[PDB]
Each structure stands twice: as structure tokens, then as C-alpha cells.
Amino acid sequence: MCDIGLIGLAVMGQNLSLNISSKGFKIGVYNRTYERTEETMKRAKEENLVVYGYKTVEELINNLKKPRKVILLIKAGPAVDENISNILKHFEKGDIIIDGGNEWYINSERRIKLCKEKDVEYLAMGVSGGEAGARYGCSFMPGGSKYAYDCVKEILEKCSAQVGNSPCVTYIGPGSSGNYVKMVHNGIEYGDMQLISESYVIMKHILKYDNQKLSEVFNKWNEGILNSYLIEITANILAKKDDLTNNYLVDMILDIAGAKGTGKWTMLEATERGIPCPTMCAALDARNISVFKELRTKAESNFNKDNILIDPNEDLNDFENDLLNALYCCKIISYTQGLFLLKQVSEEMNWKLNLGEIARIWRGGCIIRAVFLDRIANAYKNNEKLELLFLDNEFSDDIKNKLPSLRKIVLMATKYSIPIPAFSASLAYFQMVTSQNLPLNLVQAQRDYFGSHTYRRTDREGNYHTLW
Template identity: 50%
Template sequence: MYKYNSIYRENKKNTLLYFCYDAIIDGGNEWYENTERRLDDAASKGLFYLGMGISGGEDGARKGPSLMPGGHKEAYQIVHPILTKIAAQVDDGPCVTYVGPGGAGNFVKMVHNGIEYGDMQLISEAYDILKNVADFSNYELAQIFRHYNDSELESFLIEITADIFRVQDDLNSSACGKQYLIDQILDKTGMKGTGKWTVQQAAELAIAAPTIAASLDSRYISGLKDERVVAESVLEQAGLQIDPFRFRNSEKEPLQQLINRFVHKALYASKICSYAQGMNLIRAKSNEKGWNLNLGELARIWKGGCIIRARFLDQIKKAYKRNPNLANLIVDKEFSRELVEREIPWRKAVKLAVRSGISVPGMSASLAYFDAYRRSRLPANLVQAQRDYFGAHTYERVDRPGSFHTEWARIARELKSGDVRN
């Protein structure tokens, strides 16, 4: 996108002609450091520059996307009237805001996409349990996800999932009639790289993002289709027998509904943890770069237009309004209550999947994240002792300040000698 009547292309050399104080908007998915380099280059030429994340897909292009511009604030002030008209509109305003300086806009869009990876993975795991453990038909799955979309899970991704289960395949039919298209789609997931960037940044900033990382790993594994086909055969021949959860006919309906309830609760609880990871990653980068990002405002502009638009984003906005320095969504009073209410069925859904040989890395990662974050003491003390043993990395104590080192090997030898003598 270029400011109207200011920039022209010279066909032969493909160079840009511009005037001072023009505003350039880069609306593609871009690595945030590239944006920062271009900001400096633009400033040296007297130009204003915005790196603007855009989410919405085809629907957003028609009805208005979520816009995440960052960079020169002067550029945003120039194009603000245009962007507010382009953006999706929700109850509390257009889904656009000045995100922050530098590469903030592109970074936020990158994490948005990482959260999107997590959302899609969690929904696919819910589908896997409901179809392959509870034995729901595609028609029933469409009804279930329509019901989910009338609940706290209301979102664009849940809505389109319900639609997907209803679509029949025009290219393939059987004696029983048309088949559902979802069953004819190859189970290999593509990607464009923003999920990988998100996980890399989480590692760089020492931010735990296990749900998002699990979603990325799942896409990698999905790409190993040929290997998975061979592995299934080899392991069956080796004697692997999964004892899946089975229903007796007399109990089928009530047990199906029970599993549906477990999955419903697990999906929402896992979603909270996934978003908590993404928001913490954004805050960590904001602190590192001095961007001073408003997390509640980011949740607000994601409420419409974008792929992750969802009812509960309004709760996230309110959580950060209650406490702008909120350490984690898990400890917000509303989200903590919702997590506790769903904790038991969440565990049961994961247990049921594991027992049935169904991989649920996203739900499992979210549950592990929840369990680790809520515990005041973790087994990391043993890891520190091991690191000190083999590398003299030292450790801290709980009863006094300072760093300590123990000669573990020498003490162990002395203890072994004593054991022999005794």
C-alpha cells in the first residue's frame, strides 16, 4: 500500500520516486527486525514507515480486517482516518490501533499467528477425540461445534469448523451417497513460517509457550505422512495393541455426551493457557524493546476481522484493564475461576485421549503449563543439583542467599566407601 499520488514506479529500474513526509505501509507478514531496518532507511530519506500486520483472510478483505500497524507514529497519524474505515468494526470501535514503535506491529501479528496455530491445533485435537473415541458422525460434529459456538468458545475458528463438517464431497460418492469432504482431505498441514518465528522468539526471550510449540511440532509430524503409514504397520506387526475406550450400546448416548462435555471444558481451558503464553511473549518483547505495548488494546483489536476473533478476547481486554501489569492470564480472578471449574473434566479429556492412543499435544501442553505455573515448588532443584554435579554451575538455596557449589562426586565416593566398609 502506498500513499495516494505520492509514489510512482519507474518500469525499467523498478525504483520508487517519493516526496518527503510520504507514508509507506508494508502490509505483509514480515520479520520485525526487517521492519526496523526499513524504518531507519525510510527516516534517512525523510519518509515515514509503518509495518502493519493484517489478519482477516478473504472474509476480512471484504468486511474489514484487524490491522496492527507499528513504526513511525507520524505515519499512523497520516493514515489513521483511512485505516479506521478499512478495519473491522466491533462494539468498542474499529479493530485498529497504533501498536507501538519499531517493529511492534509485525511482532504482534507474528504472535497473533502463533496463537492461531495453537487454536487450530486444540480444535483439531477436540475433533480427534470426538470422532475417533466418542464415535460422533460428521453430521453430529457439525451440531456439536455449532453448540460450542453458542458458548464461551464462540469464535471464527469454531464457527468455520462447524461449517466444514457439513460440506459433502462433489468429486467422490459411494453407493450410500456423497461422502463428507473432510474425510477426503490429506492429513498434512502447511505453514508459512510465522509459527516457527513465534516459537523461536519464545526461546530467545525465555518465555514458556508449550502449546504454541506443540502446534508447530504437530504440523511437522503431519508432514511425515509416508513415514507415519510405515510406522503404523511396523508397530502393529511388533505387537502394539491400543485398548481404546469402548462403549456398550446401552451406554452409548450418555457416554458420548459425557465425553463431549469433557472435551468442551478441556478445549476452553487449554485455549486460556495458549493465549496466556502468547500475551506473555508480546509483553516480554515489549519490555525488552521499550515498546510499552497495551495488551488489553491488542485483545480489543483482535475481537473483529481477524482469524482468532473470539468472544473471550473481551475478557482478556477486561483482565488487562483490571491489572495492566497482570503476570499471567491464569491468575486473573475471572480466568482463574474458569480454569478451576474446568480442571477435572480437562484432566479427564486428556486421560481419555492418552488411554485411547490419541495424540493431544496441545491440550497436554496446556495442562502441563497450568500445573507447572500453579505450583510453588517444582523439581527444578534436582536439575540444578545435576548441573552443579557435572558442570559446577552452582545453585541457590531456599534458606540463605548466595550461590553454592558442592563436590558431589567426592562426597558420593566417600559415601560408597563407607557403605562398603559397613
């Protein structure tokens, strides 16, 4: 009998089947269409690995050992519920359903409760790493049934990314906390990608760096404090040559990058729960504005943007490293908004997430994997109740040392009419969070004028209204 079952063989579950078999476990498999079930065992016997193939979902359910554990990697839709309903027919008490797809967390909380209304235990697990992380080591974020995580952890611990000793797996928490963490993960991924793209345009359009020089600076930044998966791949991307022309491949890609849904979700949670995430607002704005490509062409023909002529006595020494410090400053700020949202929702949902180990599971396999997340993990284990992360003593010293660089990057781009909303929002976010008095006294005074919303006073309690 098999140890684990896996429904849904895309480019993501296939390689997870190979990983599970590569680590001493052997897996059962089912797909709606059987050509991909055909292709998977093809690659299994190629790599000298055994994977059992099945045509109906019933034969594989009966070919697992109790408690039966099944993983789903099918796309979000009614298909998730037609699989889960039909798995429930054959499943009995104590059996485990593990959803690995990126699903809206409210959907999971609904399905955890329907499935335990049959005492079928549900594990909503977010997976990150793509199809490289699948095959060799991803970042697992399982949440929901603590019982189900305990019976399957051993499969996850040896199939995840190993940072030294540490497997990139941890019990996230109860309910749909697994999808919420993974959702916040791609929110921080969207912001990291936007900040990198804005650093790319500062060097190319102010220091007027060619595409290879940009690849070197990213290969030099990747050697450092911002050593990350995304920074290293930009160095590779910027150096890549097209095979149809003699140009760099990135320069021939049309600048339309829409939102694929997941990352969009984090801004909805931010808005409705009242937790600001400005770095992510700029990231979604950049993606959404790019979609109107033929409106932006008409707009530029009316508002022609001139080539960037830099002042001859503008000083640009250390600007490459000021952008270094600025980018690192904006990443500290970007994670601060993400983890503050996680912390707050953790308290409202009563999940009591451990952000120290969430940072530690994210050190490998995922898209945002960086040495930076080891500083975060060490920060929260030093202070387990830290709300904002740059309030940590080391991080606060990093902000105070590198914030002038962020000011000068925003100043230089502002003067030369280069838009970097993520950089501007990140420094705007810091200046408002760290200010005791904000101009919302005038707003509260305005609302009382026309709407009688009442206001509160500095020196006394109670709500007051005045005829101005």
C-alpha cells in the same frame, strides 16, 4: 490527486483497494505485472467504484497528495527492498511507507531506520482477515511512526472490522511492534487450530461421532463461550460434501499441513528469549510430523494402532461438555502464553504495548476473532499491568471451575492411546507455572556434579559448589 497508494495486487491488496474506495477514499495502484492491475479496475467499475491504475511506480507517486502515503502488500523477499529503495527515489521528507505484508520484525526495525535516514516515515502494519477481511473489514495492527499512523488512521478506521462502535485498529507501538503482534496472533491461531483438531478426534474416536454430528457440536459450541470464527468454519467443513465421491470433503483431504513460515517464527522468539509456549510447540510438532506422511505409514504398519474400543462401563455422560470446558480451559492457557510473551518482549523492547486494546482490535476481522477476546480486553483494562492472564480474578475462577474437565479429557484420551499434545501441554503448562517448587533442584544438582556450574541454596545467598 489520490489519498492513498497501493503497491502489490495479489488476492489481498486488490480487495483492500476496493475497500478503500468503498469507504469514500480513492486509491492509486501499481503492479509489476499489469494484468492484475488490469483486473483490479475491472472489478472496480463492476462494483460501481473508482480505482486509478498506473503502469510505472513513478506516475502514481506523483498522483498522491502530500504527505504521500503508500501501502505495500508484496511477499517477503528482496522484492520488498527493491520496491522500498525505488519508492525512496521519488519520496521526500514527511512521506509515508506502509508495509502490510507479514514480515520478520527484525527486517522491519532495519527498514524503519534506513527509511528515516532519509526522513521517510515507515509504518510496519500487520493485517489479518485474509481476503474476506480485506474487502469488507480486517484487523489492522500498525506500528512504528506515530506520525504516519496519525495521517493514515482515518483510512484504517473506516476500512477495518467494526465491533459495534470500535474500529479494529489501534496504534500498536514504536518500531516493528506491528509485525510482532501479528506474528503472535498467528501463533495463537496455530494453537487454536490444533486444539480444535484434537477436540474433533476426541469426539470422533471416543464418542464415535459421525462427521455431521461433529458439525452440530461445533455449531453448538459456536453458540457459546467459544463463539469464534474458527469454530464456526469447522462446523461448515465437517458437513461439506465432496463433489467427486459421496463422502465428506474433509475425510478425503490428505493429512499433510506444513508450516507456512509466519507461525514458525513465534516458536523461534519463544526459544531464544526463554519464554515457554508449550501449546504452540505441540501445534508445530503436529504440523511437522504430518509432513513425513510416508514415514508414518511405515511406522503404523510396524506399530499397528487398534480401533478404539471404549470400556462398556466407562461413564461418558457430560463428556461432550467436559471437552467443552477442557477446550475453553486450554484456550485461556493458550492466550496466557502468547500474551505473557508479548508483555515480556514489550518490556525488553520498550514498546509498552496495550494488551487491552490489542485484544479489542482482534475481536473482529482476524482469523482468531471470538467473544473470548472481549473478556481479555476487559481484563487488561481492569489491571493494566497483569502479566499472566489467568491470574485475573474472573479467569482464575474459570480455571478452577473447568480444570477438572481438562484433567478428565487428558485422562480419557491417555487411557485409549489417543494423542492430544496441545491438551496435555496446556494442562502440563498450568501445573508447572502454578507450582512454587519444581524438580529443577535435581537438575541444578546434576549440573554442579559434572560441570561445576554451581548452585544456589534455599536458606542463604551466594553460589555454592560441592564434591558429591
